[PDB]
């Protein structure tokens, strides 16, 4: 725009109002999710399928990275131990 108590109460009011309306929008989204899950028990199943596939892909990538590190350290250890 173009002492302490004023800014204090002002931030109290605006922040509490923002928090209430954010929690209300979250409640609306949760209601929509509940309705769609209870009355359309097929899009939630598709969501579970996608989530499980993503989890499997993430696990595969992690195990690949672990195998790469393991092979690197195996070569490093095979280099040493020598005389």
């Amino acid at each position: 725009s173009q002492d302490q108590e004023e800014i204090r109460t002002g931030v109290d009011q605006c922040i509490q109002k923002f928090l209430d309306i954010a929690r209300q929008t979250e409640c609306f989204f949760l209601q929509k999710r509940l309705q769609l899950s209870v009355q359309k028990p097929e899009q939630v199943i598709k969501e579970d399928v996608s989530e499980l596939r993503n989890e499997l892909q993430r696990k595969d990538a992690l195990v690949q990275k672990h195998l790469t590190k393991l092979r690197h350290w195996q070569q490093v250890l095979e280099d040493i131990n020598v005389q």
Partner: protein
């Protein structure tokens, strides 16, 4: 000095109070007595209100006498005022908004050792009583020996810029000073309870992303254990319950409590 500023601000209010109190005595007198439903009640009410108003004038006058003893260019001042205002406003807003966070999930380590060393040195710069000795006997995992006066010798075990294990020991006790005695006990029950409370504080102070404020708060909470054996319990008042000094300090409130007397 700041103390002078407060005395002047208090005095300005005291002058305003004296003027308002004197106006109140005369303004109420002008209205005069009210019916009050009873002869005794009306006389008592008028006398009580007048006497309270007369006393307030005396109290306000006395404060002013006592407070006497205690005590291209304008744009720059405007910028200074706006900077102070934004600082206070953003501080209050960040506090109020991070106190209540609506984040519910994350899904929608590697760290430089010199960075950890710099963080530890910055933390050691403050709290002049505490002295932290950095050492890396086993790997990049750092081990900190923190001496608190003649009171405590804490053994923090970093795995990263992360606190993993803490074992406080007495000052007279030996940390063996060398290859660090990570695994041992203090042989005194008080310091064992302090180790338990330190592990509890570690489990409590756990910020998700930022790894520096956690160590800051842990060191600040440890620094509270410098008035040990000195400041009594804030619930029962005594120093000793079953031969133990008060070994617990409330998080968010650096007070003193026997752990049997809870928070």
């Amino acid at each position: 000095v700041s103390v002078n500023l407060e005395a002047f601000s208090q005095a300005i209010s005291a002058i305003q109070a004296l003027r308002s109190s004197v106006s109140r005595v005369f303004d109420c007198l002008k209205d005069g007595m009210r019916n009050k439903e009873t002869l005794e009640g009306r006389e008592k009410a008028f006398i009580a209100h007048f006497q309270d108003n007369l006393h307030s004038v005396n109290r306000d006058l006395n404060e002013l006498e006592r407070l006497s003893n205690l005590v291209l260019y304008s744009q720059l001042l405007q910028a200074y005022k706006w900077s102070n205002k934004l600082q206070y406003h953003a501080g209050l807003a960040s506090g109020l908004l991070n106190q209540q966070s609506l984040k519910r999930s994350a899904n929608q380590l590697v760290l430089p050792p010199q960075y950890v060393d710099d963080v530890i040195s910055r933390i050691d710069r403050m709290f002049p009583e505490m002295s932290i000795h950095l050492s890396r006997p086993n790997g990049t995992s750092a081990m900190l020996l923190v001496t608190l006066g003649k009171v405590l010798k804490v053994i923090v075990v970093m795995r990263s810029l992360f606190i993993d294990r803490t074992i406080v020991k007495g000052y007279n006790e030996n940390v063996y000073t060398e290859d660090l005695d990570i695994w041992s006990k203090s042989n005194y029950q008080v310091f064992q309870k302090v180790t338990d409370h330190a592990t509890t504080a570690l489990l409590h102070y756990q910020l998700p992303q930022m790894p520096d404020v956690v160590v800051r708060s842990f060191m600040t909470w440890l620094r509270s254990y410098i008035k040990l054996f000195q400041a009594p319990c804030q619930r029962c008042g005594k120093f000793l319950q079953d031969g133990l000094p008060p070994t617990w300090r409330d998080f968010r409130t650096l007070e003193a409590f026997h752990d049997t007397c809870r928070q």
